[PDB]
Amino acid sequence: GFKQDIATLRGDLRTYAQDIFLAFLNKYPDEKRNFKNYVGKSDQELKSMAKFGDHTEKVFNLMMEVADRATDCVPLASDASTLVQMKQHSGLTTGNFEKLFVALVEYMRASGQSFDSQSWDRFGKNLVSALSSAGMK
Ligand code: HEM
């Protein structure tokens, strides 16, 4: 289930975080625009940069903490608020977050692993309405 998936993901965090983020950026190249330093680079060039790994690991770790704190795949309103208000998410809309979750789910379905891909979809949908409720366009 969903709680075991957090343990799995977390077992090899930096590896999953970069694989999932690459799948997001290649599914939706328009989104790369938000990541000016990553433009013009192949997957392997990105994975060779320390700062790519460091940044994905940090995002993913926070995502796993938000997932951990959820109840039945509904995140806490305060976690959503942390997400809306961080400086770093200044120009974003809820559309950027739903694209991310589509790629996550699609990555999970395609991997070998017994992820509970349906719980992750539902989590992403409930995150997106929580983000809206906390002030995001
Ligand atoms: C639940 C999903 C997400 C979480 C937990 C999250 C969290 C974070 C965190 C913790 C950072 C700062 C990392 C650091 O200090 O190096 C960050 C940065 C950033 N995030 Fe997110 N984020 C999420 C989704 C997104 C999405 C969907 C976008 C855009 C599509 C996005 C765009 C950015 C950008 C552009 C930065 C700045 C990176 C930099 O300037 O180095 N984030 N996010």
TrEMBL record:
Record: residues binding heme b 4: K36, H55, H89
Transmembrane segments: none
UniProt binding sites for heme b 10: K58, H89
A UniProt-annotated Pfam family: Globin
Keyword Transport: yes
Positions annotated to bind heme b 1: H55, H89
SUPFAM superfamilies xref list: Globin-like (SSF46458)
Domain Globin: 1-136
Positions with a binding annotation for heme b 2: H89
List of residues binding heme b 9: H55, H89
Binding positions (heme b 7): H55, K58, Q88, H89
Residues that hold heme b 8 according to the record: H55, H89
Binding site for heme b 12: H89
Binding site for heme b 5: N37, H89
GO molecular function, one term: oxygen binding
Residues annotated as binding heme b 3: H55, H89
Annotated heme b 6 binding sites: K51, H55, H89
Keywords: Heme, Iron, Metal-binding, Oxidoreductase, Oxygen transport, Peroxidase, Transport
Record-linked PROSITE patterns: GLOBIN
Annotated positions binding heme b 11: Q88, H89, F97
Family as reported in the entry's similarity comment: Belongs to the globin family.
Name the record gives this protein: Dehaloperoxidase B
Organism of this sequence: Amphitrite ornata
